[PDB]
Amino acid sequence: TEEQIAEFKEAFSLFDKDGDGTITTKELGTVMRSLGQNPTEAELQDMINEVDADGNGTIDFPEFLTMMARKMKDTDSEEEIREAFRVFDKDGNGYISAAELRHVMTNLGEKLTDEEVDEMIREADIDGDGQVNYEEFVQMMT
Ligand SMILES: CC1(C)c2[nH]c3cc(Cl)c(Cl)cc3c2C[C@@]23CN4CCC[C@]4(C[C@@H]12)C(=O)N3
Ligand SMILES: [Ca+2]
Ligand SMILES: [Ca+2]
Numbered sequence: 001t002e003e004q005i006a007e008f009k010e011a012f013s014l015f016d017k018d019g020d021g022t023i024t025t026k027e028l029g030t031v032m033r034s035l036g037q038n039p040t041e042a043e044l045q046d047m048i049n050e051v052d053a054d055g056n057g058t059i060d061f062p063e064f065l066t067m068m069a070r071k072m073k074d075t076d077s078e079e080e081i082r083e084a085f086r087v088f089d090k091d092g093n094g095y096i097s098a099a100e101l102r103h104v105m106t107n108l109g110e111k112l113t114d115e116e117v118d119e120m121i122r123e124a125d126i127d128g129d130g131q132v133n134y135e136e137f138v139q140m141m142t
């Protein structure tokens with residue numbers, strides 16, 4: 001929803017007391033304690049680490065959407081990698097062929113040669129079927 005998001009940026013701004021675009025443990029604890037909870041500092045750090053995709057100890061708005069989605073960061077990252085994968089998997093069959101890779105990359109401004117493309121598919125083609133599936137796409141990227 002679009003207004004579910006607008007609600008969420010409202011929430012984020014409230015929690016981000018000082019407006020610097022990040023939520024700290026202290027800001028998080030203030031909110032938790034205002035709702036009748038007594039989380040330890042370790043527990044507050046844990047809440048943050050669970051969505052802390054960039055590893056900087058604070059929550060920004062994109063990581064907060066993970067938290068509002070309630071999710072863990074690996075789950076969230078998997079859903080984002082799958083969205084990138086579907087950009088390349090034009091026919092939607094679950095495999096990035098060499099032609100799909102060449103086509104999408106060209107239309108995104110990167111034209112590689114034919115044998116660059118064939119080697120990119122080869123490199124990430126673990127099981128040797130000639131195409132790049134999702135798990136191979138994840139691996140390729142790490
Ligand atoms: C040139 C890159 C490294 C790459 N190399 C590939 C090899 C294969 Cl086999 C396939 Cl299918 C796709 C790619 C892509 C698309 C990528 C994925 N990377 C993730 C982080 C940055 C970057 C760079 C770029 C990105 O944003 N787009
Ligand atoms: Ca802040
Ligand atoms: Ca962060």
Ligand SMILES: [Ca+2]
Nearest residue numbers: 089091093095
């Ligand atoms: Ca495909």
Ligand SMILES: [Ca+2]
Nearest residue numbers: 125126127131
């Ligand atoms: Ca494969």
Ligand SMILES: [Zn+2]
Nearest residue numbers: 062066076080
């Ligand atoms: Zn995310």
